[PDB]
Amino acid sequence: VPSWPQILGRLTDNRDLARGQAAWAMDQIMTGNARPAQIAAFAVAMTMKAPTADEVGELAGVMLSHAHPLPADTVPDDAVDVVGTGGTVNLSTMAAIVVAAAGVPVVKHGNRAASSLSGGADTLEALGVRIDLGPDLVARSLAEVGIGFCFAPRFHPSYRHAAAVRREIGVPTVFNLLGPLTNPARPRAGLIGCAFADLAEVMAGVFAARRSSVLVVHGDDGLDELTTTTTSTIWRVAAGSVDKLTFDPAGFGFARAQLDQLAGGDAQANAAAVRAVLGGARGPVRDAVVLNAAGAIVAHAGLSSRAEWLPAWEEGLRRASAAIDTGAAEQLLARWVRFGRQILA
Amino acid sequence: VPSWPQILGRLTDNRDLARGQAAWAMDQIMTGNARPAQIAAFAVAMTMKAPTADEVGELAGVMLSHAHPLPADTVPDDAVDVVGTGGDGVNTVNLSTMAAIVVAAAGVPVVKHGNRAASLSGGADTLEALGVRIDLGPDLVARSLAEVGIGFCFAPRFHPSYRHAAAVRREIGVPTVFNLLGPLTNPARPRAGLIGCAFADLAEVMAGVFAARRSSVLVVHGDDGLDELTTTTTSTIWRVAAGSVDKLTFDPAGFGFARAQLDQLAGGDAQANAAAVRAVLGGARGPVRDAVVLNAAGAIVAHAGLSSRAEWLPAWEEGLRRASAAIDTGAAEQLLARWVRFGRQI
């Protein structure tokens, strides 16, 4: 019979949990039954033990079970997520728009900045996108615009107890991996960036168990996106298995960049950077958008077949660049904004 | 400057804290400034990183700075503590309580410190089940020391500011670095002690805290995992005196103790513990008496370390004879009765 003493005792002893123990803990957390101290002890102990893919799957699966779903048959079978976890202008917001403009449906998931968890909501808001929508309007956005956004607090109202604890302790934990694994629209493909290099192998194992087509990505400079500044580690998930690879953007003709050139600031500065890139401005920010958009496209392609790596990337990069240069990406953002403004009437 | 995100991130990254960071955390906890979540995160992260003696000394020192002291000059200079930190999920409060009575009856002043656990993890509960008055203010514990030669500091009484940490420790149950603080925060500050620890790594850490204090202490760990000197096999002892530590392997067979089974050395609930106390102090022979005598003798040795003529082995020979005589001549039994009387008479 599961208890906090028993579960925490096992973690502090540096032991993997028994099956079901992670799930039980998550259910206590999601039901308002776990005290802030119990939530905090578990979050910290799980992090220092080092979670396994099976334990993270239990946490995500229980949390998903408490989430509002999107209506049935409203998510295309081949939707993708584009996101980074924890850890500079929001490349993932721009790449998502570019990917959708290339004809791949995108469903994002997040909160406002520095909260649980993955976000990007502030930037979208700064652009005039209505972020706060229920499942029916997300599904409609997805069908009519090609992109949608799931606002975490709206879709995961039962995570409020954990969210409040994460704020009190303000240190990164296992709970930081949950955003990409609990997207309410359950896309089967994704480009997933992870700051914490070690946990990215674990995240990938969960996507493998799900039979997802995902590139989990780690900038060897510490970024949670694919980088132009140096190389990257990629976990390529498809057909139930992971294989780690080194990724070098110079091998496609990208110039090495400086971290000072991807810098960000308030929501408005970053909205200006989005508008610049979508309007065709060239530079290392664009380079970085195209690259991450290509990865997501390559992930998406992995749903249908196994195409070979370098030609998949060659096509993804071209599709991303063309989504920008035809004006399709700018025009998609404009349709997204128009869609949100039509809801009022 | 310090914050929870900074201290917690350092611990979860498996780094030792910077000097003063443990102290800051502890003071936030003791002033009611820490949220339950922050308290629990820190307790757990400190445990999983593996606390050093410097970190633990900071925690204990801050906690002591908030404790009620006993009145000036009421604690004999040579008072001793006898206590364990607890097992998983067993304990030896039976042995500690009995050894403390026996040591006091041998003529060594004893000042214990503790709390009620609730079932099988106390303690003050055993003493309470013996008719001892556990809940006494500093002035009465002092009188208890003077008139009976023993006393008990009830933790919720002497450490009222620890209440926020105690509530969290309760909420989460799991043993943490906080479980090491009992022996190190006895409000009477005895300079000598026999201190048991279930875990050899943490025992060394505790030895290093006591070494910074110039205590004369034996930190003890049975090599079967008992938080006391065991009779089932060897024990490791960290002998602490004059600011240094002498780690050694101890074998009671060398003093003619028969090997016991782990099945034999209790303890259990308040009541089981009380009956065991009655029997042993009445002269009942067997594994329990042996463990009690062995542990009271170690406390006597640590005491001898204060005014230190005796060498190790003759000190052990003397402690063993004094402990056995305290029981056999009925002095232990009489002292317990006297202690009960003192509590009724106030």
Ligand SMILES: Nc1cc(F)ccc1C(=O)O
């Ligand atoms: N309810 C939530 C769900 C999330 F995923 C993140 C944050 C909250 C919140 O209550 O702030």
Ligand SMILES: Nc1cc(F)ccc1C(=O)O
């Ligand atoms: N205030 C306390 C001090 C201790 F050492 C142990 C428990 C409490 C409490 O408030 O329950």
